[PDB]
Homo-oligomer: A and B are copies of this chain.
Amino acid sequence: HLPSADWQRAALSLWTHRTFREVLKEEDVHLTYQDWLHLELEIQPEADAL
């Protein structure tokens, strides 16, 4: 769909990679609902990307 498939494959490799997943658990890094809200409000109605 979106821009360069190389960046996409890089993102997918990192997503699938093990140590990312085992690291994600013991985490304040786990993206609290409020943090999600902060970022989704930071993005705009102007540049959509969707």
- Count of this chain's copies in the oligomeric assembly: 5
Near B by CB (< 8 A), chain A positions 34-50 give 44-46
Chain B residues with Cβ under 8 A from A45's Cβ?
45-46
Chain B residues with Cβ under 8 A from A44's Cβ?
46
Near B by CB (< 8 A), chain A positions 18-46 give 44-46
Closest B residue, CB atoms, query A44:
B46
Binding site for B on A (CB under 8 A): 44-46
Nearest 4 A/B pairs, CB to CB:
A46-B46, A45-B45, A45-B46, A44-B46
Of the A-B pairs whose beta carbons lie under 8 Å apart in the complex, a sample of 4, sorted by A's number, is A44-B46, A45-B45, A45-B46, A46-B46
